[PDB]
PDB file of C-alpha atoms and ligand atoms in Angstrom:
ATOM      1  CA  UNK A   1      47.926 -16.708 -29.659  1.00 50.10           C
ATOM      2  CA  UNK A   2      46.008 -18.743 -32.245  1.00 48.72           C
ATOM      3  CA  UNK A   3      42.495 -18.932 -33.682  1.00 51.24           C
ATOM      4  CA  UNK A   4      41.282 -20.940 -30.673  1.00 50.41           C
ATOM      5  CA  UNK A   5      41.944 -17.994 -28.356  1.00 51.03           C
ATOM      6  CA  UNK A   6      40.016 -15.639 -30.650  1.00 54.66           C
ATOM      7  CA  UNK A   7      37.076 -18.054 -30.814  1.00 53.73           C
ATOM      8  CA  UNK A   8      37.101 -18.339 -27.013  1.00 50.86           C
ATOM      9  CA  UNK A   9      37.138 -14.536 -26.737  1.00 52.92           C
ATOM     10  CA  UNK A  10      34.161 -14.272 -29.100  1.00 51.88           C
ATOM     11  CA  UNK A  11      32.290 -16.922 -27.101  1.00 53.17           C
ATOM     12  CA  UNK A  12      32.994 -15.068 -23.844  1.00 51.63           C
ATOM     13  CA  UNK A  13      31.745 -11.826 -25.408  1.00 54.05           C
ATOM     14  CA  UNK A  14      28.565 -13.601 -26.484  1.00 57.12           C
ATOM     15  CA  UNK A  15      28.125 -15.018 -22.980  1.00 57.61           C
ATOM     16  CA  UNK A  16      28.515 -11.574 -21.411  1.00 61.74           C
ATOM     17  CA  UNK A  17      26.119 -10.023 -23.940  1.00 61.59           C
ATOM     18  CA  UNK A  18      23.149 -12.115 -22.739  1.00 58.66           C
ATOM     19  CA  UNK A  19      23.098 -12.443 -18.942  1.00 58.69           C
ATOM     20  CA  UNK A  20      20.282 -12.684 -16.425  1.00 57.46           C
ATOM     21  CA  UNK A  21      19.194  -9.560 -14.569  1.00 56.75           C
ATOM     22  CA  UNK A  22      17.969  -9.280 -10.963  1.00 55.04           C
ATOM     23  CA  UNK A  23      14.382  -8.386 -10.112  1.00 55.57           C
ATOM     24  CA  UNK A  24      14.332  -4.604 -10.444  1.00 53.49           C
ATOM     25  CA  UNK A  25      10.566  -4.848 -10.966  1.00 56.89           C
ATOM     26  CA  UNK A  26      10.127  -5.200  -7.200  1.00 55.83           C
ATOM     27  CA  UNK A  27      12.153  -2.033  -6.573  1.00 54.78           C
ATOM     28  CA  UNK A  28      10.158  -0.063  -9.150  1.00 55.14           C
ATOM     29  CA  UNK A  29       6.936  -1.391  -7.609  1.00 56.13           C
ATOM     30  CA  UNK A  30       8.080  -0.244  -4.163  1.00 55.06           C
ATOM     31  CA  UNK A  31       8.916   3.202  -5.547  1.00 55.74           C
ATOM     32  CA  UNK A  32       5.454   3.453  -7.113  1.00 58.00           C
ATOM     33  CA  UNK A  33       3.706   2.191  -3.955  1.00 57.67           C
ATOM     34  CA  UNK A  34       5.465   4.913  -1.946  1.00 62.38           C
ATOM     35  CA  UNK A  35       3.294   7.459  -3.777  1.00 64.02           C
ATOM     36  CA  UNK A  36       0.096   5.726  -2.649  1.00 63.67           C
ATOM     37  CA  UNK A  37       1.460   5.546   0.902  1.00 62.91           C
ATOM     38  CA  UNK A  38       2.115   9.296   0.846  1.00 63.83           C
ATOM     39  CA  UNK A  39      -1.342   9.993  -0.600  1.00 61.77           C
ATOM     40  CA  UNK A  40      -3.063   7.890   2.070  1.00 59.57           C
ATOM     41  CA  UNK A  41      -0.983   9.471   4.850  1.00 58.79           C
ATOM     42  CA  UNK A  42      -2.679  12.835   4.274  1.00 65.83           C
ATOM     43  CA  UNK A  43      -6.160  11.665   5.310  1.00 66.88           C
ATOM     44  CA  UNK A  44      -5.208  10.881   8.922  1.00 66.29           C
ATOM     45  CA  UNK A  45      -5.947  14.367  10.280  1.00 67.89           C
ATOM     46  CA  UNK A  46      -9.670  14.376   9.474  1.00 66.28           C
ATOM     47  CA  UNK A  47     -10.232  10.848  10.804  1.00 63.88           C
ATOM     48  CA  UNK A  48      -8.345  11.595  14.021  1.00 62.22           C
ATOM     49  CA  UNK A  49     -10.214  14.868  14.568  1.00 61.43           C
ATOM     50  CA  UNK A  50     -13.599  13.221  13.999  1.00 62.55           C
ATOM     51  CA  UNK A  51     -12.763  10.363  16.368  1.00 63.07           C
ATOM     52  CA  UNK A  52     -11.535  12.737  19.077  1.00 61.51           C
ATOM     53  CA  UNK A  53     -14.510  15.101  18.810  1.00 64.30           C
ATOM     54  CA  UNK A  54     -17.349  12.587  18.328  1.00 63.62           C
ATOM     55  CA  UNK A  55     -16.159   9.428  20.096  1.00 60.96           C
ATOM     56  CA  UNK A  56     -16.714   7.092  17.139  1.00 59.16           C
ATOM     57  CA  UNK A  57     -14.996   6.390  13.847  1.00 58.75           C
ATOM     58  CA  UNK A  58     -16.251   8.068  10.657  1.00 61.21           C
ATOM     59  CA  UNK A  59     -18.418   5.936   8.416  1.00 63.06           C
ATOM     60  CA  UNK A  60     -17.522   7.164   4.931  1.00 63.07           C
ATOM     61  CA  UNK A  61     -15.654   9.928   3.111  1.00 60.61           C
ATOM     62  CA  UNK A  62     -18.523  12.418   3.395  1.00 59.77           C
ATOM     63  CA  UNK A  63     -18.763  12.107   7.181  1.00 56.66           C
ATOM     64  CA  UNK A  64     -14.996  12.431   7.664  1.00 55.13           C
ATOM     65  CA  UNK A  65     -14.804  15.620   5.601  1.00 53.84           C
ATOM     66  CA  UNK A  66     -12.707  14.613   2.591  1.00 54.71           C
ATOM     67  CA  UNK A  67     -13.353  14.382  -1.135  1.00 55.45           C
ATOM     68  CA  UNK A  68     -14.872  11.386  -2.890  1.00 57.73           C
ATOM     69  CA  UNK A  69     -12.832   8.254  -3.540  1.00 57.20           C
ATOM     70  CA  UNK A  70     -12.724   8.762  -7.315  1.00 57.59           C
ATOM     71  CA  UNK A  71     -11.412  12.325  -6.862  1.00 56.57           C
ATOM     72  CA  UNK A  72      -8.314  11.508  -4.759  1.00 55.50           C
ATOM     73  CA  UNK A  73      -6.216  10.340  -7.706  1.00 51.74           C
ATOM     74  CA  UNK A  74      -2.549  10.577  -8.607  1.00 47.11           C
ATOM     75  CA  UNK A  75      -0.100   9.388 -11.248  1.00 49.87           C
ATOM     76  CA  UNK A  76      -0.308   5.758 -10.085  1.00 51.84           C
ATOM     77  CA  UNK A  77      -3.196   5.809  -7.562  1.00 51.33           C
ATOM     78  CA  UNK A  78      -6.780   5.367  -8.747  1.00 55.08           C
ATOM     79  CA  UNK A  79      -8.850   5.955  -5.602  1.00 57.41           C
ATOM     80  CA  UNK A  80      -8.582   6.350  -1.828  1.00 57.11           C
ATOM     81  CA  UNK A  81     -11.500   5.324   0.385  1.00 55.30           C
ATOM     82  CA  UNK A  82     -12.279   5.668   4.093  1.00 54.14           C
ATOM     83  CA  UNK A  83     -14.695   3.125   5.583  1.00 54.65           C
ATOM     84  CA  UNK A  84     -15.235   2.761   9.349  1.00 51.75           C
ATOM     85  CA  UNK A  85     -11.820   4.249  10.119  1.00 51.81           C
ATOM     86  CA  UNK A  86      -9.554   2.454   7.618  1.00 49.40           C
ATOM     87  CA  UNK A  87      -7.916   4.145   4.624  1.00 50.43           C
ATOM     88  CA  UNK A  88      -7.498   1.896   1.577  1.00 46.73           C
ATOM     89  CA  UNK A  89      -5.682   2.936  -1.603  1.00 46.31           C
ATOM     90  CA  UNK A  90      -6.109   1.180  -4.952  1.00 48.15           C
ATOM     91  CA  UNK A  91      -3.636   1.272  -7.829  1.00 49.67           C
ATOM     92  CA  UNK A  92      -4.499   1.914 -11.474  1.00 49.10           C
ATOM     93  CA  UNK A  93      -4.835  -0.563 -14.353  1.00 49.55           C
ATOM     94  CA  UNK A  94      -2.673   1.002 -17.095  1.00 52.08           C
ATOM     95  CA  UNK A  95       0.765   2.639 -17.281  1.00 49.89           C
ATOM     96  CA  UNK A  96       1.630   0.936 -13.977  1.00 47.63           C
ATOM     97  CA  UNK A  97       4.072  -1.843 -13.111  1.00 47.87           C
ATOM     98  CA  UNK A  98       2.608  -5.266 -13.846  1.00 48.91           C
ATOM     99  CA  UNK A  99       3.193  -6.571 -10.315  1.00 49.17           C
ATOM    100  CA  UNK A 100       1.092  -3.905  -8.553  1.00 50.95           C
ATOM    101  CA  UNK A 101      -1.769  -3.545 -11.037  1.00 48.14           C
ATOM    102  CA  UNK A 102      -5.082  -3.320  -9.198  1.00 46.94           C
ATOM    103  CA  UNK A 103      -3.698  -3.968  -5.705  1.00 43.93           C
ATOM    104  CA  UNK A 104      -4.693  -2.408  -2.386  1.00 45.70           C
ATOM    105  CA  UNK A 105      -3.077  -1.442   0.912  1.00 44.06           C
ATOM    106  CA  UNK A 106      -4.692  -0.189   4.104  1.00 43.32           C
ATOM    107  CA  UNK A 107      -3.929   2.052   7.080  1.00 44.07           C
ATOM    108  CA  UNK A 108      -5.698   1.839  10.436  1.00 43.07           C
ATOM    109  CA  UNK A 109      -5.256   3.106  13.983  1.00 44.31           C
ATOM    110  CA  UNK A 110      -5.791   1.688  17.468  1.00 43.51           C
ATOM    111  CA  UNK A 111      -6.405   3.716  20.626  1.00 41.28           C
ATOM    112  CA  UNK A 112      -4.317   3.151  23.759  1.00 38.98           C
ATOM    113  CA  UNK A 113      -4.482   4.649  27.241  1.00 41.03           C
ATOM    114  CA  UNK A 114      -1.927   7.369  26.489  1.00 41.72           C
ATOM    115  CA  UNK A 115      -1.310   7.394  22.739  1.00 45.20           C
ATOM    116  CA  UNK A 116      -2.820   6.549  19.354  1.00 46.42           C
ATOM    117  CA  UNK A 117      -0.795   4.142  17.214  1.00 48.10           C
ATOM    118  CA  UNK A 118      -0.978   3.888  13.424  1.00 48.17           C
ATOM    119  CA  UNK A 119      -0.423   0.718  11.394  1.00 47.03           C
ATOM    120  CA  UNK A 120       0.296   0.204   7.697  1.00 49.53           C
ATOM    121  CA  UNK A 121       0.235  -2.932   5.573  1.00 51.39           C
ATOM    122  CA  UNK A 122      -2.159  -5.447   4.045  1.00 52.18           C
ATOM    123  CA  UNK A 123      -5.854  -4.620   3.514  1.00 50.79           C
ATOM    124  CA  UNK A 124      -7.962  -4.613   6.680  1.00 50.81           C
ATOM    125  CA  UNK A 125     -11.678  -4.053   7.323  1.00 50.08           C
ATOM    126  CA  UNK A 126     -13.693  -3.120  10.415  1.00 52.09           C
ATOM    127  CA  UNK A 127     -17.278  -4.130  11.170  1.00 50.83           C
ATOM    128  CA  UNK A 128     -18.915  -1.228  13.045  1.00 51.55           C
ATOM    129  CA  UNK A 129     -18.033   2.293  14.180  1.00 51.19           C
ATOM    130  CA  UNK A 130     -17.430   1.436  17.847  1.00 48.77           C
ATOM    131  CA  UNK A 131     -14.152   2.676  19.306  1.00 49.84           C
ATOM    132  CA  UNK A 132     -13.164  -0.750  20.688  1.00 51.19           C
ATOM    133  CA  UNK A 133     -13.935  -3.042  17.737  1.00 53.97           C
ATOM    134  CA  UNK A 134     -11.005  -5.094  16.486  1.00 54.22           C
ATOM    135  CA  UNK A 135      -9.898  -5.268  12.850  1.00 54.46           C
ATOM    136  CA  UNK A 136     -10.220  -8.335  10.628  1.00 52.33           C
ATOM    137  CA  UNK A 137      -8.393  -9.146   7.377  1.00 51.25           C
ATOM    138  CA  UNK A 138      -9.615  -8.703   3.801  1.00 55.44           C
ATOM    139  CA  UNK A 139      -8.664 -11.167   1.053  1.00 54.81           C
ATOM    140  CA  UNK A 140      -9.720  -9.351  -2.126  1.00 56.12           C
ATOM    141  CA  UNK A 141      -7.052  -7.823  -4.395  1.00 54.78           C
ATOM    142  CA  UNK A 142      -4.266  -7.903  -1.813  1.00 52.46           C
ATOM    143  CA  UNK A 143      -0.808  -6.518  -2.521  1.00 50.82           C
ATOM    144  CA  UNK A 144       2.230  -8.757  -2.126  1.00 49.66           C
ATOM    145  CA  UNK A 145       4.649  -8.277   0.757  1.00 51.98           C
ATOM    146  CA  UNK A 146       7.626  -8.065  -1.624  1.00 54.54           C
ATOM    147  CA  UNK A 147       6.333  -4.754  -3.048  1.00 57.34           C
ATOM    148  CA  UNK A 148       6.227  -2.890   0.285  1.00 56.57           C
ATOM    149  CA  UNK A 149       8.909  -1.334   2.497  1.00 54.92           C
ATOM    150  CA  UNK A 150      10.039  -3.283   5.539  1.00 51.83           C
ATOM    151  CA  UNK A 151       8.297  -0.745   7.785  1.00 48.74           C
ATOM    152  CA  UNK A 152       4.894  -1.143   6.080  1.00 49.67           C
ATOM    153  CA  UNK A 153       4.484  -4.880   6.645  1.00 49.75           C
ATOM    154  CA  UNK A 154       2.107  -5.018   9.605  1.00 49.32           C
ATOM    155  CA  UNK A 155      -0.536  -7.689  10.182  1.00 49.33           C
ATOM    156  CA  UNK A 156      -4.162  -7.657  11.291  1.00 50.30           C
ATOM    157  CA  UNK A 157      -3.222  -9.024  14.735  1.00 50.14           C
ATOM    158  CA  UNK A 158      -0.666  -6.295  15.485  1.00 52.04           C
ATOM    159  CA  UNK A 159      -1.265  -4.350  18.692  1.00 50.28           C
TER     160      UNK A 159
HETATM  161  C1  WKE B   1     -20.657  10.431   9.831  1.00 53.02           C
HETATM  162  O1  WKE B   1     -20.153   9.153  10.206  1.00 53.02           O
HETATM  163  C2  WKE B   1     -21.063   8.502  11.090  1.00 53.02           C
HETATM  164  C3  WKE B   1     -20.448   7.193  11.570  1.00 53.02           C
HETATM  165  C4  WKE B   1     -22.396   8.246  10.392  1.00 53.02           C
HETATM  166  N1  WKE B   1     -23.369   7.822  11.377  1.00 53.02           N
HETATM  167  C5  WKE B   1     -23.956   6.631  11.325  1.00 53.02           C
HETATM  168  O2  WKE B   1     -23.759   5.829  10.427  1.00 53.02           O
HETATM  169  C6  WKE B   1     -24.895   6.307  12.448  1.00 53.02           C
HETATM  170  O3  WKE B   1     -25.926   7.298  12.507  1.00 53.02           O
HETATM  171  C7  WKE B   1     -24.128   6.298  13.764  1.00 53.02           C
HETATM  172  O4  WKE B   1     -25.024   5.990  14.837  1.00 53.02           O
HETATM  173  C8  WKE B   1     -22.931   9.482   9.674  1.00 53.02           C
HETATM  174  O5  WKE B   1     -23.970   9.090   8.770  1.00 53.02           O
HETATM  175  C9  WKE B   1     -21.844  10.217   8.901  1.00 53.02           C
HETATM  176  N2  WKE B   1     -22.365  11.483   8.425  1.00 53.02           N
HETATM  177  C10 WKE B   1     -22.647  11.717   7.144  1.00 53.02           C
HETATM  178  C11 WKE B   1     -22.469  10.570   6.192  1.00 53.02           C
HETATM  179  O6  WKE B   1     -23.034  12.810   6.764  1.00 53.02           O
HETATM  180  O1  G3P B   2     -14.639   7.018  -3.763  1.00 53.53           O
HETATM  181  P1  G3P B   2     -15.810   6.263  -3.186  1.00 53.53           P
HETATM  182  O2  G3P B   2     -15.682   6.196  -1.684  1.00 53.53           O
HETATM  183  O3  G3P B   2     -17.098   6.959  -3.554  1.00 53.53           O
HETATM  184  O4  G3P B   2     -15.851   4.773  -3.791  1.00 53.53           O
HETATM  185  C1  G3P B   2     -15.612   4.551  -5.163  1.00 53.53           C
HETATM  186  C2  G3P B   2     -15.950   3.107  -5.515  1.00 53.53           C
HETATM  187  O5  G3P B   2     -16.434   3.047  -6.838  1.00 53.53           O
HETATM  188  C3  G3P B   2     -17.015   2.583  -4.559  1.00 53.53           C
HETATM  189  O6  G3P B   2     -16.599   1.348  -4.023  1.00 53.53           O
END
């Protein structure tokens, strides 16, 4: 070889040293959001029991029989709230991935003639406590669909 080959080798080493990386931030965000999903999954029992025994959805945390919103906290979850039958979880503002800072996701259920189905995805709000009221969509501090698992990507019109 000659000096040209050595210079080419050095240039190739420099090229390999600085290369672009894929978006692992989305994967880390999904891993962190899984914790909030698990935390919100544990409040289904009280809501279901209240609906079955009273015939209408619970109004707030106190009526359902769970702790206050500011007390249901985890490593990456700030608060979990129940309002008219929907469970919304809000992330924290520090020591959390930048893409899911201050975002929310919601869980809600619909009653059928022989089963009760549960949905998970973007934030959703209900108007009153009636058992047949539909669910609208909320557009305040909404999480992005790229930070959620493929299973938890439901819409407000799902039935
Ligand atoms: C239990 O949840 C109920 C929906 C709520 N009731 C009402 O808001 C209306 O009275 C329904 O006609 C209760 O206030 C809740 N109980 C509490 C907060 O202790
Ligand atoms: O936890 P809670 O349902 O009391 O709500 C906390 C929040 O500050 C009120 O929106």
